[PDB]
Amino acid sequence: GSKAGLDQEIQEHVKKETSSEENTQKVDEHYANSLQNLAQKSLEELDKATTNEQATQVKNQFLENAQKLKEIQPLIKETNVKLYKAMSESLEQVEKELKHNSEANLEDLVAKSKEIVREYEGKLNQSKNLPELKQLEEEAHSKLKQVVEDFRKK
């Protein structure tokens, strides 16, 4: 127990490095794929050039665009991170809102149903004969059905 925190800290340093290098590999692979696509498009433009100057310009523009592409890779990773965080936080907010609202609706319906039951139990406890009992029981069940139906159709 006394050494658990230190073990966790050492393992966490190692995990930080391994996660850093794995994210580096992912960024490198995406960058290499984008660079291959850029190069293929520039090579197609070059094959269709009609002038040595147009061809040299295709090459120079490829080099410029390759520099631009390399410059944005860490920003690409940071943008993906921020997008995922925003999605997760919005999902959690909406989840807690839905939980609260559904619980409130259920509590209101349960309160109304228990109130119908209490009213008619109070009436039934004062019953003097069997016909009154049957009439009150039927009215109570009809009121309960009306309440639960109105809620299902709310």
Curated annotation (Swiss-Prot):
Region (IgA-binding): 3-154
Subcellular compartments: Secreted, Cell wall
Disulfide bridge map: none
Name of this protein: IgA FC receptor
Shown part of the complete sequence: 258 to 409 of 1164
